[PDB]
Design a protein around this ligand. Structure first.
Ligand SMILES: NC(=O)c1ccc[n+]([C@@H]2O[C@H](COP(=O)([O-])OP(=O)(O)OC[C@H]3O[C@@H](n4cnc5c(N)ncnc54)[C@H](OP(=O)(O)O)[C@@H]3O)[C@@H](O)[C@H]2O)c1
Ligand SMILES: NC(=O)c1ccc[n+]([C@@H]2O[C@H](COP(=O)([O-])OP(=O)(O)OC[C@H]3O[C@@H](n4cnc5c(N)ncnc54)[C@H](OP(=O)(O)O)[C@@H]3O)[C@@H](O)[C@H]2O)c1
Ligand SMILES: C/C(C=O)=C\CC/C(C)=C/C=O
Ligand SMILES: C/C(C=O)=C\CC/C(C)=C/C=O
Lengths: 365, 365
């Protein structure tokens, strides 16, 4: 195909928590559909760490249609699209615009396009806005055959565009609904591992205890997650395997864990005392505990010689608070299994795996 | 070795909920280590359904040592022992004597014995008798590396005899701790699927609704189980694969379910109405409402031409009562996964598959 590649990927959201994994996994010689040529699209200018990646980086505001057409239409060789991004808000039309503009720019020009992977999430099973009355969310373990809830969810819009555009043209599709993503990206708007690692790094820096600010339920309830590299495996799988073509597929590690056990590992990996859930104590907003704490992070990045990140950029404490008030949100991976996908991760090891990687990439050690 | 077999299995507890699966899985040509010769042991005289199997049945009371020597010592060809039985009570020593008498009989006589699979269970993680005050069990997800609880448990006695006897001789070993077993045996003391099916069959017979008698928690909590065939696959795996030798291994379906969803499928498969958990209602002994109900079952077996089974023999309502006042007992299959075992079951499909199979063998409808 191109030069002498077998497949050419277009990772939209390459700086993302999943997009970064695709930027590594795709370039492996063992990766199916290889050898892979990878285009990586993000809004920000290419960071230092992604410059060290064998990926044709593309700086484009996908919300801007004319800019998208200008930068993507020359890419005649694209074979698989991995839409792994979102605007940063739950705005349905702005998110749809991005996805539309990708398809509007590539489909007519890419003469050998085959597949489009659309990544959404488990929120497709329980998304609710105006809380205080009706519309009851689905019960878990969530299965892909569950119908949409009567609410505005941009996941709906994205699927609609996906189903239609991949229908008008002889294209295959695949919808991926990952669980909580354990990743390493420092520029994700939702990186739970980096967030908790930052909180840990700061607790240690001030010689304070790693205090669990969450709820009683989230401390003891069964929770599930998914390694970012696995979501990469799962999306690549659906991209090349006929068995997974035109299918909606969940994606988790295959196991369950508890935050009480994660919290201990987090403290052990940092060598500090931890304060687990106190009986009777109510949840405290970690976003409040870490407000006005940026200078402390600025200092840490200097003193520890870490890759320059701002606290707002690498940590989403609001996202932790939500996860720490969430129970009964486990998804099923039977479908992918029965379709032949045998990918799994020990969630406990995966968490440490993400800590170690962000240490290796100088985001946190 | 024998006749023209590569492996000769001694299944101890062949009429059991797992032993009966082993009686089927082992005789398949696909099964690793094949072709298998199978000796099957139980205290009762061979049932009609086991008579229809290619398994050398041996009626022996293993609690009797001299009897065990008399019937097992002439089996010079045994290669693998699958101890999948228990006395019926929590009696440590009485359970131990059985496992002893097996090893005391076969080991000196079987000159090509290689492996001994010991099946126990997840009660290794939460066995308690004086549950009114002190002594606290482990927390889930249960892992194999969890230390024994300071409580008399015959699982400990079995492992000790296992570790020692497999040490004195040059034998491998494997401890299996299955979760709730979804099986088909009509002569098991703990068959949760046959029990609930029997209850459903009776509710249908009297034109009554399938009323959930359990607790609120067990209705909503995540639960896990294991297909008996999977346990058979998992023990056979540990008996032929060097990666699994000398290892403690849990055994579940790899997923989680809820009883509220199982209960609905049970009503659907029997085509009757059902009453789920009622808010405020408390658990009712299924054993109590099914007592003085054996007269009805004797009639049902006749009218439906079912295989002659007494109510107390095929159903353990006390065991259902226990399952319906339980939660937080999920085990981890990560260890077996990482060792290479990729066996899994959709627990929902497994449960229906067990209903279907017992209908095929005329234990039900
Ligand atoms: N995060 C999780 O734990 C998680 C878990 C389950 C499901 N999901 C879902 O998976 C989907 C993917 O989200 P994610 O978590 O992968 O996102 P992420 O890791 O926060 O990264 C988002 C990517 O999109 C790019 N982007 C955002 N706005 C853009 C624009 N206007 N133009 C061009 N590029 C833009 C970003 O690049 P810049 O750096 O330039 O902004 C970034 O690379 C989301 O729908 C999310 O709901 C996420
Ligand atoms: N049942 C479950 O759902 C479950 C789940 C997880 C773990 N486990 C554990 O797995 C282990 C195996 O139990 P299981 O469920 O396989 O038992 P089971 O299905 O109730 O069957 C027990 C077997 O042992 C035989 N047996 C009993 N006493 C005997 C004696 N004195 N001499 C010879 N044979 C005898 C029985 O044959 P007869 O019919 O002749 O007595 C029967 O075939 C147990 O430790 C149990 O705790 C069970
Ligand atoms: C809901 C939750 C913790 O409550 C985590 C999931 C967040 C995400 C991105 C779900 C997929 O849209
Ligand atoms: C404990 C329980 C429901 O409470 C189910 C497990 C029963 C068994 C046989 C566990 C293995 O010892």
């Amino acid at each position: 195909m191109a030069k002498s590649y077998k497949s050419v990927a277009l990772v939209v959201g390459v700086t993302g928590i999943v997009g970064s994994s695709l930027a590594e996994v795709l370039k492996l010689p063992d990766t199916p559909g290889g050898p892979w040529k990878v285009y990586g699209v993000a809004r920000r200018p290419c960071p230092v760490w992604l410059a060290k990646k064998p990926v044709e980086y593309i700086q484009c505001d996908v919300s801007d249609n004319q800019e998208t057409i200008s930068k993507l239409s020359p890419l005649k060789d694209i074979t698989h699209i991995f839409y792994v991004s979102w605007i940063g808000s739950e705005d349905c039309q702005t998110n749809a615009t991005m996805f539309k503009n990708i398809l509007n720019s590539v489909i007519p020009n890419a003469s050998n396009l085959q597949h489009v992977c659309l990544q959404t999430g488990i929120k497709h099973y329980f998304g609710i806005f105006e809380e205080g009355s009706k519309v009851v969310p689905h019960d878990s373990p969530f299965t892909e055959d569950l119908p949409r809830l009567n609410v505005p969810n941009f996941y709906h819009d994205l699927e609609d565009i996906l189903y239609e555009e991949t229908g008008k043209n002889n294209l295959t599709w695949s919808v991926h609904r990952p669980a909580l993503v354990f990743g390493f990206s420092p520029c994700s708007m939702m990186n739970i591992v980096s967030t908790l690692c930052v909180y840990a790094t700061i607790c240690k820096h001030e010689n304070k205890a790693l205090v669990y600010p969450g709820s009683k339920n989230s401390w003891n309830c069964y929770a599930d997650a998914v390694d970012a590299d696995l979501v990469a495996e799962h999306e690549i799988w659906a991209a090349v395997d006929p068995k997974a073509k035109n299918q909606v597929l969940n994606c988790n590690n295959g196991d369950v864990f508890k935050w009480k056990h994660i919290w201990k590992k987090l403290a052990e990996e940092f060598g500090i005392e931890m304060v687990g859930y106190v009986e009777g104590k109510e949840q405290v907003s970690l976003a409040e505990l870490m407000k006005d704490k940026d200078q402390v992070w600025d200092e840490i990045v200097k003193k520890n010689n870490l890759v320059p990140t701002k606290l707002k950029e690498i940590a989403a404490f609001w996202f932790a608070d939500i996860a720490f008030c969430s129970e009964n949100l486990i998804s099923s991976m039977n479908k992918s299994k029965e379709l032949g996908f045998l990918g799994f991760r020990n969630s406990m090891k995966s968490f440490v795996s993400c800590i170690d990687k962000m240490r290796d990439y100088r985001f946190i050690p």
